């Protein structure tokens, strides 16, 4: 009878594999298996994550083929992947990320070997593209109902675990079903390779190609955007002619939610492209 | 709260018992079965579903259009269940008029008595002496004292009074219930070891009317169809012969159309003999006198003579009824009502 | 962005309470396949939520937020309309028994709208017109009391139609019970109009 | 205490209000809703399962729909019958002594004074059916009030309760039959029978079903049903033979002498002046019931009571008689 | 005639009608439809008169 | 859109007929608060960006 | 022009975008299209149709030798009924050869159980014949609708003869039939 404060390490491998698996996350139930290595009690690291073929039955213990699982795991053992399985993941579209009776039964059956048995449910269907916040699930012991529910130390990270604060699922089904915190990790090779890879993904090939395109489109296409920009500017100035009357009458309180200032600041920012690219044309013409 | 105390303490095992029996798919009823694996089912939400049969329910226990429990996760049939109120409401087991009310028909009472009383008493005599016992008779025409011979046939069984079925209960809202009605009362007729079933008021289901043509043509398919039985009993009671479909389909299995209009002089004293167990009649009252002092006095009309005359005997505040005290009720209820009718 | 989780809440429903229960479990009439009885949130009291009113209810937590909703004619009329123009205060010291209303019977050629809106236009006060739907405008006349009210639409044996008409006769009788009953707001003066057997 | 406050998770946020259909002896009942969702779950606490009377609205959940509680229905049943015993007996009205001893002898012989009822061996538990040309509860309640002296009573006035709502069917008649079953020593009184006189196709089938359940095909002698309409021609001839099987009677025309007796009864407790004549009062009336003369006796006793006097003068009773002369002509 | 001529159109415009036959029997030939003559339609017209006392004694003997 | 009960918050009727209570976004001014207007929320966020003419 | 409003069959309306593959040709309004559950993209459109239009545009009879199997046989055509048959094999022989369509007109389609306003079907179907440039009309078993109206006809005969009056008004009335062809088949 002892418990610690565990935290699931999530690298970009399992993340991107759950993003491609979320793209393949059809309404039909899907299956997946997580791998890794157990170094101590209160830490768990995932490295290898793959997908499983779909079945008409869906998420179930019968769909997990032991000769296929052990066959692929053996083919990972003959390669440079000497990691044992650490858990299984799946997708729950529509009805929420909670776990049904079948999922908790195959979780109870799959947790006999690994005491941790990390469970992750990805649901990118109804989640907006602004946040990719994912949560890992855990199974509590049925004999711990007499004593405290979760005797987990280091209660600081629970404030970060309070971000999924839906008022129906977390404490709507929190009995006999709790969760765990999630952190990330990134080395310098992922930082510089993925950082320079994304900057290059927003940059050009030689980085000098599409500059003169806009530098010379300022004279052909942007002129229409400058004339229309002046049409919006005058289209606001026609009301700014009426503003000094109200400002000359009341001077107390603000009733119009429009600021008429920051939009024109943005118009000036779009208009400064001519100034910033004029020096570019000066460099291209010079040398 | 005192009832909820012992059950509240008995609510602990309801959590460990909540995982089973949780399955409920709104009790969807099936329609037919093309093959044994796949069953076509239709839910009440007008959504037709198809699922395979589970291992907990035998295929021989499946009935056409049977409401059974079915899972909403595996979609399989976990456990069936036995379950209109008019069907069980129409059950009738009560003693009633005996044979003593024969309405003067000397030959007709034997034409129906040899088919209502004799075939049950002598099953081997009619199979060996012939090929099968007779089918039944057909009482129709003028109402008069109708339904008296029906109670006669009900009470004149030496074993147990049987069920009678009126026809005015099928013309109701939500048509289609008649099919399951006749199929489950004929199924119960198979359960009652070849019991006899009487069908009253065929005119209330015969003679748009296609929704009635379903129940009455299916009724013909269940009568001419010997699946429940083709030998027990056939008898219909109607006021008018304006039902041509049962009249043209009846020669297949129904037979022996007879009539029962009115009794004779020596019969009304026998309806008074069955009224000897009615409201207390003094020994001074002669049944032959009161019987002969009223012509055109069929068993129903003199049943109303004993009803209204019974009412005036109650209003008289007397210990016993005397003919001199209710004869005014007799000739008043037959003559004052015979004036306009 | 903290509200973005309430955007992810898929919105919220519109609850309508029809009956309050004493067990702190108020049933709320909702959209069909609704009728979800539930206890309200702890920061909102139960007694304040009145039945037969619409409220704001969340779609998952089922918690309540708040409650939801002619020179001679002008010479003779100066004492009637031109008197309350300049001295609204004198209506408490003056004890000369100012009249409550005035009637003008005859062919309504000029004087029904141009006179009342012209002299009332000199009064610079609001002009409310009458134009069962005959009681809500009387409640509006109770709210905005200081004005010039004029009958224009009604000017056109006992029976049920004389009982329904007797509802408006009761409206003007209680106008004599309020006006002639007790003065509560200066400048209450009205003008009658009647041209027939009435 | 904790076991009482631990089932709050089921009655918490995931809670709904459904409509139960029936209770099955296999400890799992069937419920319904707007779409008719049938879920069977083992019963829980706080339920009665005996007085529940299936077929009403119950409490459901967003969960597997375990029944956590129930909610009482129809406060509408309260306005159906009266539970008091009025002092108006069968000896307070005259002229129709035979007409009142016909129903008194008709329905007061069963269950009371049984030596003339159970020794005969007839038991016609159907009762008589009456109709009052004045109606308005005065004559029909003055004849039915004889049974109200020392007995339980059941009253039903008007067919509005069937027509003021959607076509639920004969379930309300089943409620009257179960309250009459649990209240067998009572008298069923149906008043203002204007079902077919006032969809319309369903009124005929719930009225013929009213005749079906009213006939008592499965019940023994349990209660005496007394029906009372206004016009005997509105009722179809099919509602006569099954329903009316005991006896029916006719009521005379209340023109001068029956209105003189009604006036005497309505002016027996009150005090009137000597100059109050009767010929003008029984002359100015024309086909009037007792509710309006009771209304002018009430407003005449109050109007004469305005002067702190109980004596009703002739001019004040004619001034109140103008309400009678106007009301019937309006 | 709409339904009947529809059936005759399904016995005239359908060359793959070589499948299951459609046997018909009429109790009287007073109103004889002239459009019932075709290879697929009612072409086999074998007259079945009233059996004589000999034939009635035969069918009654075997029955 | 059905009704506006207060500032920065109103009710909106869905296409299925059920009325929804959603807090409007602060960027949208009071011009889009017309009672009879063609408002359009999000499929998941259920927030209005602009109305349709 | 890039993003427009869609109307789903179920009742709720949505707005979608434009896919980089398709163009603005089929994107014009008034054309039923298809959508996807994810991202509400557009794969292709959905051409509308009707129920009887499937029957009028689906039946096809094969066989090209039947045109040469009619035997030694070398604005309207009358196929009457002497003691010799095979008119269905010939009309269905050329109809099975090309016929340019399968516009079959059955004599049981002018029943009009309700009020006899079959003029909407004469002008509707013959308006389809005038709309489509090629058209061939078959009229088999016209003897049922070919009543001679010798005596005073009832309401059932007067409406059929009124459709014959529309046939008169559209054959020798104020409308030519130079391009369309009708084949009147009968029995007597
Ligand atoms: Zn699922």
UniProtKB/Swiss-Prot annotation, chain A:
E.C. number(s) listed in UniProt: 3.4.19.-
GO cellular component, one term: extracellular region
GO molecular function terms attached to this record: endopeptidase activator activity; K63-linked deubiquitinase activity; metal ion binding; metal-dependent deubiquitinase activity; metallopeptidase activity; proteasome binding
Domain MPN: 8-143
Residue positions where Phosphothreonine is found in the record: 243
Binding site for Zn(2+): 90, 92, 103
Keywords for this protein: DNA damage, DNA repair, Hydrolase, Metal-binding, Metalloprotease, Phosphoprotein, Protease, Proteasome, Ubl conjugation pathway, Zinc
GO biological process, one term: protein K63-linked deubiquitination
PROSITE patterns: MPN
Positions carrying Phosphoserine: 127, 201
Superkingdom, natural source: Eukaryota
The keyword Nucleotide-binding is annotated on this UniProt entry: no
Expression sites (tissue/organ): Widely expressed. Highest levels in heart and skeletal muscle.
Record-stated family: Belongs to the peptidase M67A family. PSMD14 subfamily.
Name of protein: 26S proteasome non-ATPase regulatory subunit 14
Gene expressing this chain: PSMD14
UniProtKB/Swiss-Prot annotation, chain C:
Location of this chain's protein in the cell: Cytoplasm; Nucleus
Main location: cytoplasm
Binding residue positions for ATP: 106-113
Modification Phosphoserine occurs at: 61
GO cellular component: blood microparticle; cytoplasm; cytoplasmic vesicle; cytosol; cytosolic proteasome complex; extracellular exosome; inclusion body; membrane
Keyword ATP-binding (UniProt): yes
GO biological process: negative regulation of DNA-templated transcription; negative regulation of programmed cell death; positive regulation of DNA-templated transcription; positive regulation of inclusion body assembly; positive regulation of proteasomal protein catabolic process; proteasome-mediated ubiquitin-dependent protein catabolic process; regulation of transcription by RNA polymerase II
Keywords carried by this UniProt record: Acetylation, ATP-binding, Cytoplasm, Nucleotide-binding, Nucleus, Phosphoprotein, Proteasome
Record-level Gene Ontology MF annotations: ATP binding; ATP hydrolysis activity; DNA-binding transcription factor binding; general transcription initiation factor binding; proteasome-activating activity; TBP-class protein binding; thyrotropin-releasing hormone receptor binding; transcription factor binding
Family: Belongs to the AAA ATPase family.
Protein name per Swiss-Prot or TrEMBL: 26S proteasome regulatory subunit 8
Species in which this protein is naturally found: Homo sapiens (Human)
Curated annotation (Swiss-Prot), chain D:
Covalent cross-link site, Glycyl lysine isopeptide (Lys-Gly) (interchain with G-Cter in ubiquitin): 143
One GO MF term: proteasome-activating activity
Effect of residue 226 to T: In BKAH; uncertain significance; contrary to the wild type, it fails to rescue eye defects in Rpt2-null Drosophila
GO cellular component entries: cytosol; membrane; nucleoplasm; nucleus; proteasome accessory complex; proteasome complex; proteasome regulatory particle, base subcomplex
GO biological process: proteasome-mediated ubiquitin-dependent protein catabolic process
Record keywords: Acetylation, ATP-binding, Cytoplasm, Deafness, Intellectual disability, Isopeptide bond, Lipoprotein, Membrane, Myristate, Nucleotide-binding, Nucleus, Phosphoprotein, Proteasome, Ubl conjugation
UniProt KW Nucleotide-binding keyword: yes
Positions where N6-acetyllysine occurs in the chain: 164
Membrane topology: Lipid-anchor
Subcellular location: Cytoplasm; Nucleus; Membrane
Binding site for ATP: 132-139
Bias-annotated ranges (Basic and acidic residues): 1-11
Disulfide feature: none
Subunit structure: Component of the 19S proteasome regulatory particle complex. The 26S proteasome consists of a 20S core particle (CP) and two 19S regulatory subunits (RP). The regulatory particle is made of a lid composed of 9 subunits, a base containing 6 ATPases including PSMC1 and few additional components. Interacts with SCA7. Interacts with NGLY1. Interacts with PAAF1.
Family to which this protein belongs: Belongs to the AAA ATPase family.
Protein name: 26S proteasome regulatory subunit 4
Organism: Homo sapiens (Human)
Segment of the intact protein contained: 93 to 432 of 440
Swiss-Prot record, chain E:
Disease: Deafness, cataract, impaired intellectual development, and polyneuropathy: An autosomal recessive disease characterized by early onset of deafness, cataract, severe developmental delay, and severely impaired intellectual development. Patients later develop polyneuropathy of the lower extremities, associated with depigmentation of the hair in that area.
Entry's localization field: Cytoplasm; Nucleus
PTM description: Sumoylated by UBE2I in response to MEKK1-mediated stimuli.
Subunit annotation: Component of the 19S proteasome regulatory particle complex. The 26S proteasome consists of a 20S core particle (CP) and two 19S regulatory subunits (RP). The regulatory particle is made of a lid composed of 9 subunits, a base containing 6 ATPases including PSMC3 and few additional components. Interacts with PAAF1.
Similarity field: Belongs to the AAA ATPase family.
Domain of life: Eukaryota
Source species: Homo sapiens (Human)
Name of protein: 26S proteasome regulatory subunit 6A
């Amino acid at each position: 009878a002892v418990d610690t404060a565990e935290q699931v390490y999530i690298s970009s491998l399992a993340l991107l594999k759950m993003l491609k698996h979320g793209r393949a996350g059809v309404p039909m139930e899907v299956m997946g298996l997580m791998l890794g290595e157990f170094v101590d009690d209160y830490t768990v690291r995932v490295i290898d994550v793959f997908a499983m073929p779909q079945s008409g039955t869906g998420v179930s213990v019968e769909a997990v083929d032991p000769v296929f699982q052990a066959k692929m795991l053996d083919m990972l053992k003959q390669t440079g992947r000497p990691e044992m399985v650490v858990g299984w993941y799946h997708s729950h579209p529509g009805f929420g990320c909670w776990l049904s009776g079948v999922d908790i039964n195959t979780q109870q059956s799959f947790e006999a070997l690994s005491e941790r048995a990390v469970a992750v449910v990805v649901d990118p269907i109804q989640s907006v593209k602004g946040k990719v916040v994912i949560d890992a699930f855990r199974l509590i012991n049925a004999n711990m109902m007499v004593l405290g529910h979760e005797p987990r130390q280091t209660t600081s990270n629970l404030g970060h675990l309070n971000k999924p604060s839906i008022q129906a699922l977390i404490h709507g089904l929190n009995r006999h079903y709790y969760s765990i915190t999630i952190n990330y990790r990134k080395n310098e090779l992922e930082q510089k390779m993925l950082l320079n890879l994304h900057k290059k993904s927003w940059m050009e090939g030689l980085t000098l190609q599409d500059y003169s395109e806009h530098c010379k489109h300022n004279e052909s296409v942007v002129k229409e955007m400058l004339e229309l920009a002046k049409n919006y500017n005058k289209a606001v100035e026609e009301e700014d002619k009426m503003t000094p009357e109200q400002l000359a009458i009341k001077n107390v309180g603000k009733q119009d939610p429009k600021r008429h200032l920051e939009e024109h600041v943005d118009v000036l920012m779009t208009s400064n492209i001519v100034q910033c690219l004029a020096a570019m044309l000066d460099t291209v013409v010079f040398k | 709260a005192p009832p909820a105390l012992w059950d509240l303490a008995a609510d602990k095992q309801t959590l460990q018992s909540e995982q089973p029996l949780q399955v409920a798919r709104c009790t969807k009823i099936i329609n037919a079965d093309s093959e044994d694996p796949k069953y076509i089912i239709n839910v009440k939400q007008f959504a037709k579903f198809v699922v395979d049969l589970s291992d907990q329910v035998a295929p021989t226990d499946i009935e056409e259009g049977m409401r059974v429990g079915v899972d909403r996760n595996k979609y399989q049939i976990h456990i069936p269940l036995p379950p209109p109120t008019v069907t069980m409401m129409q059950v009738e087991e009560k003693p009633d008029v005996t044979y003593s009310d024969v309405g003067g028909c000397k030959e007709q009472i034997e034409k129906l008595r040899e088919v209502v009383e004799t075939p049950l008493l002598h099953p081997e005599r009619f199979v060996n002496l012939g090929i099968e016992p007779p089918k039944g008779v057909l009482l129709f025409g003028p109402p008069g004292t109708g339904k008296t011979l029906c109670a006669r046939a009900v009470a004149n069984r030496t074993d147990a009074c049987f069920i009678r079925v009126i026809g005015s209960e099928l013309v109701q809202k939500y048509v289609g219930e008649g099919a399951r009605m006749v199929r489950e009362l004929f199924e119960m007729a198979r359960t009652k070891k070849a019991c006899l079933i009487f069908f009253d008021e065929i005119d209330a289901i015969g003679g748009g009317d296609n929704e009635v043509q379903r129940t009455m043509l299916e009724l013909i398919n269940q009568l001419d169809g010997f699946d429940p039985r083709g030998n027990i009993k056939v008898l219909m009671a109607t006021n008018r012969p304006d039902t041509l479909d049962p009249a043209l389909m009846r020669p297949g299995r129904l037979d022996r159309k007879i009539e029962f209009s009115l009794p004779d002089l020596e019969g009304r004293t026998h309806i008074f003999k069955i009224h000897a167990r009615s409201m207390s009649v003094e020994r001074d009252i002669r049944f032959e006198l009161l019987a002969r002092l009223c012509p055109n006095s069929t068993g129903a009309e003199i049943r109303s003579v004993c009803t209204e005359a019974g009412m005036f005997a109650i209003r008289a505040r007397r210990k016993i009824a005397t003919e001199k005290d209710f004869l005014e009720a007799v000739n008043k209820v037959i003559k004052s009502y015979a004036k306009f009718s | 962005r903290e509200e973005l989780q309430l955007l992810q809440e898929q919105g919220s429903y519109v609850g309508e309470v029809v009956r309050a229960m004493d067990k702190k479990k108020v049933l709320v009439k909702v959209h069909p396949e609704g009728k979800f009885v539930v206890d309200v949130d702890k920061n909102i009291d139960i007694n304040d939520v009145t039945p037969n009113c619409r409220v704001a209810l969340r779609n998952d937590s089922y918690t309540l937020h708040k409650i939801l909703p002619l020179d001679k004619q002008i010479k003779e009329i100066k004492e009637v309309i031109e008197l309350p123009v300049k001295h609204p205060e004198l209506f408490e010291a003056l004890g000369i028994a100012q009249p409550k209303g005035v009637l003008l019977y005859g062919p309504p050629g000029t004087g029904k709208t141009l006179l009342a809106r012209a002299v009332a236009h000199h009064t610079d006060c609001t002009f409310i017109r009458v134009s069962r739907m005959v009681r809500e405008l009387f409640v509006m006349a109770r709210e905005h009391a200081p004005s010039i009210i004029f009958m224009d639409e009604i000017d056109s044996r006992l029976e049920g139609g004389s009982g329904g008409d007797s509802e408006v006769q009761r409206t003007m009788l209680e106008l004599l019970n309020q006006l002639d009953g007790f003065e509560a707001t200066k400048n209450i003066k009205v003008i009658m109009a009647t041209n027939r057997i009435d | 205490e904790e076991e009482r406050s631990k089932v709050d998770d089921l009655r918490g946020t995931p809670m709904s209000v459904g409509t139960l259909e029936e209770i099955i002896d296999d400890n799992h009942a069937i419920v319904s809703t707007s779409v008719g969702s049938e879920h069977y779950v083992s019963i829980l606490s706080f339920v009665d399962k005996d007085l529940l009377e299936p077929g009403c609205s119950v409490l459901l959940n967003h969960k597997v729909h375990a029944v956590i509680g129930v909610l009482m229905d129809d406060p509408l049943v309260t306005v159906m019958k009266v539970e008091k015993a009025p002092q108006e007996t069968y000896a307070d009205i005259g002229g129709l002594d035979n007409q009142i001893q016909e129903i008194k002898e008709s329905v007061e012989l069963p269950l009371t004074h049984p030596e003339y009822y159970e020794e005969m061996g007839i038991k016609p538990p159907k009762g008589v059916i009456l109709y009052g040309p004045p109606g308005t509860g005065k004559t029909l309640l003055a004849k039915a009030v004889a049974n109200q002296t020392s007995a339980t009573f059941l009253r039903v006035v008007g067919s509005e309760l069937i027509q003021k709502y959607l076509g639920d069917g004969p379930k309300l008649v089943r409620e009257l039959f179960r309250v009459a079953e649990e209240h067998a020593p009572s008298i069923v009184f149906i008043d203002e029978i204007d079902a077919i006189g006032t969809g319309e196709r369903e009124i005929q089938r719930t009225m013929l079903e009213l005749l079906n359940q009213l006939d008592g095909f499965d019940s023994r002698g349990d209660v005496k049903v007394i029906m009372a309409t206004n016009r005997i021609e509105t009722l179809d001839p099919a509602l006569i033979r099954p329903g009316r099987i005991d006896r029916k009677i006719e009521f005379p025309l209340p023109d001068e002498k029956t209105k003189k007796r009604i006036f005497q009864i309505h002016t027996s407790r009150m005090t009137l002046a000597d100059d109050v004549t009767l010929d003008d009062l029984i002359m100015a009336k024309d086909d009037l019931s007792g509710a309006d003369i009771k209304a002018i006796c009430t407003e005449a006793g109050l109007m004469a009571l305005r002067e702190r006097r109980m004596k009703v003068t002739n001019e004040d009773f004619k001034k109140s008689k103008e309400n009678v002369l106007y009301k019937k002509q309006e | 005639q709409r339904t009947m001529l529809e059936l005759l159109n399904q016995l005239d415009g359908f060359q793959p009608n070589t499948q299951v036959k459609v046997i018909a029997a009429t109790n009287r030939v007073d109103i004889l439809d002239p459009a019932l003559l075709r290879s697929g339609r009612l072409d086999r017209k074998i007259e079945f008169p009233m059996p004589n006392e000999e034939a009635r004694a035969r069918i009654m003997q075997i029955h | 859109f059905l009704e506006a009960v207060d500032q920065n918050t109103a009710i909106v009727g869905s296409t299925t007929g059920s009325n929804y209570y959603v807090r409007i976004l602060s960027t949208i001014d009071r011009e889009l608060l017309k009672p009879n207007a063609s408002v359009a929320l999000h499929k998941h966020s259920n927030a209005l960006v602009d109305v349709l003419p | 022009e890039e993003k427009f409003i869609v109307k789903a069959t179920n009742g709720p309306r949505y707005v979608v975008g434009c896919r980089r593959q398709l163009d603005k040709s089929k994107l014009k309004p008034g054309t039923r299209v298809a959508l996807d559950m994810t991202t509400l993209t557009i794969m292709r459109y959905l051409p509308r149709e009707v129920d009887p239009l499937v029957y009028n545009m689906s039946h096809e009879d094969p066989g090209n030798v039947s045109y040469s199997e009619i035997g030694g046989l070398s604005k309207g055509c009358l196929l009457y009924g002497p003691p010799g048959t095979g008119k269905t094999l010939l009309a269905r022989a050329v109809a099975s050869q090309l016929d340019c369509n399968f516009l079959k007109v059955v004599s049981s389609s002018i029943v009009d159980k309700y009020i006899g306003e079959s003029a909407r079907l004469i002008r509707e179907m013959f308006n389809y014949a005038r709309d489509h440039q090629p058209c061939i009309i078959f009229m088999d078993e016209i003897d049922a609708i070919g009543g001679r109206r010798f005596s005073e006809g009832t309401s059932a005969d007067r409406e059929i003869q009124r459709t014959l009056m529309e046939l008169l008004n559209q054959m020798d009335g104020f409308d030519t039939l130079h391009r369309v062809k009708m084949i009147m088949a009968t029995n007597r």
